[PDB]
């Protein structure tokens, strides 16, 4: 009884996964048009817009204060410590993908590197809050420029840090804004179980590589990542993963690390006891530039098509970073990557009917990586963080 | 002479209605293209963009401070007291509409209830400041999401209230912003007479049901509403209506309660002597969810078409709430409501050439309802308001 | 050696003009498609979006504080003193253009005056941050409404000034914001040489009137304008022009006074020693309503076409003010001005292949005029500025 009292919200999302599959299998025969499916998955659709709402005011207020609270010279130190984690875990994942196809084996290319550089520096900061640049044959398309806003907020935040007295007001303005948006997420946590159960039920009611990706994704998230945690922190990872259980189950239903960022934040500040100044530093960047989960799913999909190496690995990386939160992101990223090799897009019509579940697993590995990444950073922060205290 | 000195701006808008009809009748024969009509009604067109400008920064700053100044638990009490007024006056109006067709008698349906729930929770708060969602066969169309911004500002404002110390800065930021935008409306008041005279003159230069609606709209605004004021407040209503005379004449020319909201605000705070904390609480919501005036005009138009009950009443309600400030709002709302019954849209081509005057009358009944509603709330506020003082 | 140490950034942009023409002439034979030209001028293209980014938060924060710091009654005095400079230098330029075609001689019209009045009062302030109104046969087109934002910020800033105590917080908020965005421009200064050298190199790799315009533009910028400086200030102008050398060379590569505004600001506050309160007052307005450079190039192009007076002068003025920062601004402004006279648009296909260099020269005369204009204002400010101190 005592476990049910405390982990009330946690077990409810566990129950939402069970009852979501149950209701999905209860209404599996579909005599109704996919239009009626959209009207059924509506209580879960509402949950998405509530989270999407809160992304932009959180992701902006988090980085602006996070880099201003931290010393401008020590932030560069901690930054390199965080980048080391990002580049390493990405290298291991792309290496893991090659081994995963060695034993088992079941818009232009240059523009995907030009539009990424173009998105990093936003031409208009308001247009950045809802539009992303992508060269098509206007040029600015729908979906938040989360990369350009993260980049700007990192330099704008650091500029306030180098201002001190005058800059203090703006930092006090964004910290009250970060707390205000985090006080709104307190209610979105309770709508999540009702949402997720109607969200996954509508997504089930609509190929050995499908199992191949899950094999790699679990071996990375349960061996590679926890072993990288135990190596530096010297602390038990399944104690750290236990705290972020509410965030990982939401990622299992959201399929967006950027939309689960508000939950992950409360799953690290409140549950695992991580300093706000370093969750605001690691997590927003990890929700936009992490490749651990996506590159391990994209690259394996880029070798399966060759049946029907250095160049393929770099193109799969700039795919997800070039699509932070764009419409039909997974669909377009796999289309552009096939032009780089030359293989036909006939195989893509098959992956769409199965990506709906695999995109949830890759986000779950990404969310785990951002959380564990923040945890690994904390141990290398202890010298710079005590300096401010 | 002494009356002309004080009520200078008031009598000038009275003179604008007279001179506007006079100039309209002076230039009634139209050998000029409707393109030339648009160039003539330009000094009135400019007035609209000046008001439209100020809607968003007022409607956001009003609710955020209004709900933060008030106690988070007492706001829920006052809210229920306000909702009681909204639901009651709407029920009387829809009942009045049935009696008005008993004696005299001269995009999908489900989507109008899905898009309303979708608009309440905005997917992006910046996209909310200029776009509204509406499923069409992109999906987000032009016109402010005033409902989603009102909803967000009510929960964001209440979150600041539950913050106290940290939240104080943001509330001080929006209250200085509410005063700044209200200091800009001081000048827009003087442009209104020159505007309205060229606005109504261009709108006259371009069916017993036309008189039927005015019969119901005046009997509601002069009997139903003032009697609801005298019943609770026990104060003379035509003394309260006298103060809001500058706001009612602007509504007679604007045809938007949301665009007359900046005038109505100064017509209650300065003219009728109503506490800012409860004008900021009632009026913005009344300008977005009031049905007293619109449902009494929409429902009567929904029975006139049947010649050439419970289901018709609920659909006419979600029409205006689903079109807070959308392009050709009255045109699209009557198109979707005819699909729910089945009657042809042939009759709609006739109502457009006469709605231009009837939309001004419905807004006038709405504006009166929001003002009287705020007045009725004040008497039920006296216990909760003295608590803060 | 000592000159190279101090003027490090200055001589690097001088070197960028040299090496930019050199690299442009090194890669002048073009066997590559204009698509490949766009991929080559990319390190200069990135510089533009970095500046464009910073326009809106600078142009808004500059005017709001600038007019609030200054007395609301004295700002009207200084304003008339600034307007006098704008109207005079524009009259001399349009007169100079008539003399320049006397000795050498080598969407509707009304809508360009209706859309300008429509843009001055923005219908939505968020839509103003990225869209400008222009009647076409939706109605709001891409490109910032810099005029509507300048107009609003001037009245919003003055409203804060007339608020005092309550208004102080918002002014402290925008001044910390002006300093934050100006601390970001410190880095964009160093990217400028690498940018400009790849920006002009890509623009060279793609008619006596071409030389005629440069004759007028230099005689105005080296005689008319410096003589207007020496007449009032009684100080050497080529000492004042020397300080703004980093800003004039950026205008020679940017072709936008609005995008060089962040550099010009640091080129007057730091280099020439001009009071922030009057640079924030003159420069943003000068970057949006100046005609000295553009009207002297547009009007000369409006007489050259007549080969293949009062009405032509007023239409060329409302062209640039109607296109503050719109896509293909110089292309559309010359198209609409030919309809006013009646001459064919066949000559316009020839000016496009040469405007790329002439648009850089007109912006340079505009930037010089805004800087010298601010300098001339300072001497007429000394009484009103010492009053605040
Ligand atoms: C391309 O996507 C990115 C941008 C940033 C980061 C790192 C990060 C994380 N995680 C955060 N929170 O801050 C900084 C980072 C640095 O590497 C460097 C650090 C920094 C310090 C001082 C000056 C800087 C100037 C520009 C950019 C970063 C700067 C801040 C990683 C990837
Ligand atoms: C659908 O459109 C609406 C939204 C709000 C309202 C009411 C209102 C008015 N008028 C204002 N100013 O505040 C609140 C209202 C409540 O009913 C409840 C009240 C409230 C108190 C505490 C927590 C809340 C949480 C969510 C929403 C309202 C809350 C605030 C009416 C219709
Ligand atoms: C059409 O484009 C413009 C708008 C403004 C200006 C002038 C200017 C410059 N430069 C600045 N910084 O402030 C003011 C100006 C005034 O003429 C008048 C002055 C002013 C003082 C008091 C009340 C005002 C009310 C409305 C507008 C300006 C006002 C401010 C020039 C052209
Ligand atoms: Ba990584
Ligand atoms: Ba400090
Ligand atoms: Ba009502
Ligand atoms: Ba308090
Ligand atoms: Ba001028
Ligand atoms: Ba003061």
* CB-count exposure of residue A12 (10 Å: 0-12, 13-18, 19+): buried
Whether the Cβ atoms of residue B97 and residue B217 lie closer than 8 Å to each other: no
- Find out whether A252 and A259 touch, Cβ atoms under 8 Å: no
Contact C54, C262 (CB under 8 A): yes
Bridge partner residues of A133 (DSSP): A140
Q: Is B234 left (phi over 0), alpha (psi -120 to 50) or beta?
A: left
Asked if residues B347 and B207 have their Cβ atoms less than 8 Å apart, the reply is no
**CA distance to A88, B188, B355, per residue, from C121 (Å):** 53, 11, 27
Domain of A338, in residue numbers:
1-388
For residues A95 and A382, the answer to whether their CB atoms sit within 8 Å is: no
Q: CB under 8 Å, gap of 24 or more: what pairs does C176-180 form?
A: C176/A160, C176/A163, C176/A166, C176/A167, C176/A169, C176/A170, C177/A170, C177/C57, C177/C61, C178/C58, C178/C61, C178/C62, C178/C65, C178/C280, C179/A163, C179/A166, C179/A167, C180/A156, C180/A159, C180/A160, C180/A163, C180/A167, C180/A170
Distance of alpha carbon A176 from alpha carbon A170, whole angstroms: 10
Q: Confirm if A74 and A66 have CB atoms less than 8 A apart.
A: no
Token pair in block for residue C43: 């390190």
- C-alpha dihedral over A41, A43, A45, A48, to 10 degrees? -140
Give the pair of three-digit tokens for residue C326.
């719109």
In the 3-class helix/strand/coil scheme, how is A46-108 assigned residue by residue? Answer: HHHHHHHHHHHHHHHHHHHHHHHHCCCCHHHHHHHHHHHHHHHHHHHHHHHHHHCCCCCCCCC
| Mutate which of C63, C79, C87, C286 for ligand 3 pocket (most atoms within 8 A of beta carbon) | C79
With residue A249 as reference, give the H or E element that holds it: helix A245-254
Q: Please identify which residue in the block is written with the tokens 């002309």.
A: B4
CB-side exposure of C4: number of CA atoms within 13 Å?
A: 2
At B29 the three-state DSSP class reads coil
SS (H, E, C) C138-179: CCEEECCCHHHHHHHHHHHHHHHHCCCCCCHHHHHHHHHHHH
Residues, CB within 5 angstroms of ligand 6 (ion): B 86, 89-90, 290-292
DSSP code of residue B142: E
Contact B127, B114 (CB under 8 A): no
Q: How far apart are CA B387 and CA B385, in angstroms?
A: 5
Give the separation between CA C345 and CA C302, rounded to whole angstroms. Answer: 11
Tell me if C133 sits within 8 A of C115, measured CB to CB: yes
> How many domains, in total, are found in chain A?
1
Gap between the Cα atoms of B259 and B265, Å rounded: 11
List all residues of chain A from 155 to 184 with a beta carbon under 8 Å from chain C.
Answer: 155-156, 159-160, 162-163, 166-167, 169-170, 173
**How many C-beta neighbours within 10 Å does residue B206 have?**
11
- Using alpha carbons only, give the angle A262, B144, B362 rounded to the nearest 5 degrees: 130
State the DSSP string of C215-280.
HHHHHIIIIIHHHHHHHHT-S-HHHHHHHTHHHHHHHHHH--HHHHHHHHHHHHHTSS---HHHHH
CA B249, B251, B254, B260: dihedral to nearest 10 degrees? 110
Task: Give the atom of ligand 3 at the shortest distance from the alpha carbon of C66.
Answer: 12
Helix residue ranges per DSSP H, chain B: 2-6, 8-26, 34-40, 42-69, 74-99, 111-120, 125-128, 146-161, 168-204, 209-219, 225-232, 237-243, 245-254, 257-269, 276-289, 295-304, 310-321, 329-341, 348-379, 382-388
Rg (alpha carbons) of chain A, rounded to whole number: 21
**Chain C residues with CB inside 8 Å of B52's CB?**
123-124
Return the H-helix or E-strand segment holding C62.
helix C42-69
The answer to whether residue C126 neighbours chain A at the CB level (below 8 Å) is yes
Answer positive or negative: Cα dihedral of B161, B167, B171, B174. negative
Which of C64, C66, C71, C75 to mutate for ligand 3's pocket (most ligand atoms within 8 Å of CB)?
A: C75
> Which residue's C-alpha comes closest to atom 12 of ligand 3?
C281
Q: How was this structure determined?
A: X-ray
Side-chain-side CA neighbours of C238 within 13 Å: the count stands at: 2
CA distance C306 to C304: 6
Of residues B15, B34, B36, the one with CA closest to residue B356: B34
Q: For strand B140-142 and strand C131-133, is the pairing parallel, antiparallel, or unpaired?
A: unpaired
Cα(B282)–Cα(B287) distance, rounded to whole angstroms?
Answer: 9
Give the 3-state secondary structure of residue A232: helix
Which residues have C-beta within 8 Å of that of residue C292, sequence separation ≥ 6? C89, C90, C93, C220, C225, C365, C366, C369
Kindly tell me the number of DSSP H helices and DSSP E strands found in chain C: 20, 2
Q: Which two tokens stand for residue C27?
A: 């890669």
Q: Give the separation between CA A356 and CA A252, rounded to whole angstroms.
A: 11
Resolution in A: 3.7
B379: CB partners within 8 A, 6+ apart: B232, B233
Q: How many CB atoms lie within 10 A of CB A380?
A: 19
Residue B219 CB-density burial (10 A; 0-12 exposed, 13-18 middle, 19+ buried): middle
Mention every residue, 6+ apart, whose C-beta is less than 8 A from residue A351. Answer: A301, A334
For the record, the structure tokens of B387 come out as: 């608590």
Three-class SS of residue A160?
Answer: helix
Q: Angle formed by the axes of helices B245-254 and B348-379, to 10°?
A: 160
Question: Which CA distances in Å does A50 have to A196, A323, B115, B158, B352?
Answer: 13, 21, 14, 17, 37
A107 contacts in chain C (CB < 8 Å): none
The CATH code of the domain that includes A97 is: 1.10.3860.10
Burial of B3 (0-12, 13-18, 19+ CB in 10 A): exposed
CA dist C156 and A152 (Å) reads 26
């Amino acid at each position: 009884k005592s476990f049910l009292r405390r982990n009330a919200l946690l077990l409810l999302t566990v129950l939402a996964v069970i009852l979501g599959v149950v209701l999905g299998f209860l209404l599996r025969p579909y005599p109704l048009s996919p239009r009626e499916v959209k009207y059924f998955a509506f209580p879960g659709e509402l949950l998405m817009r509530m989270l999407k709402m809160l992304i932009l005011p959180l992701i902006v207020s988090s980085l602006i204060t996070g880099l201003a609270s931290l010393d401008a010279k020590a932030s560069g130190r901690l930054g390199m410590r965080a980048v080391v984690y990002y580049m390493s875990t990405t290298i291991i994942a792309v290496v893991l993908g090659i081994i995963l196809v060695l034993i088992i084996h079941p818009k232009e290319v240059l523009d995907c590197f030009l539009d990424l550089a173009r998105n990093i520096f936003p031409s208009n900061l308001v247009s950045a809050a809802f539009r992303s640049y992508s060269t098509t044959y206007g040029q600015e398309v729908e979906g938040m420029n989360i990369l350009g806003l993260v980049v700007f907020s990192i330099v704008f935040g650091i500029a306030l840090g180098k201002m001190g007295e005058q800059g203090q007001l703006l930092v006090d303005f964004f910290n009250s804004l970060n707390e205000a948006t985090m006080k709104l997420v307190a209610i979105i946590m309770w709508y999540a179980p009702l949402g997720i159960l109607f969200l996954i039920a509508g997504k089930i009611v609509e190929g050995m590589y499908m199992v191949t990706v899950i094999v790699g994704l679990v071996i990375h998230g349960l061996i590679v990542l926890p072993l990288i945690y135990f190596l530096i922190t010297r602390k038990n990872p399944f104690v750290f993963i236990a705290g972020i259980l509410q965030a990982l189950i939401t990622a299992l239903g959201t399929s967006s690390s950027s939309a689960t960022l508000p939950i992950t934040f409360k799953c690290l500040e409140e549950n695992n006891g991580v300093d706000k100044r370093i969750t605001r530093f690691v997590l927003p960047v990890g929700a936009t530039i992490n490749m651990d989960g996506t590159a391990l799913y994209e690259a394996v999909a880029a070798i399966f098509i060759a049946q029907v190496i250095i160049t393929i690995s770099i193109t799969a990386t700039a795919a997800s970073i070039g699509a932070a939160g764009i419409p039909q992101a997974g669909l377009v990223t796999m289309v552009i990557v096939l032009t780089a090799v030359g293989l036909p897009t006939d195989d893509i019509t098959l992956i769409i009917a199965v990506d709906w579940l695999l995109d949830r697993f890759r986000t779950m590995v990404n969310v785990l990586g951002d959380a564990l990444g923040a945890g690994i950073v904390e141990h290398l922060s202890r010298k710079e963080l005590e300096k401010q205290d």
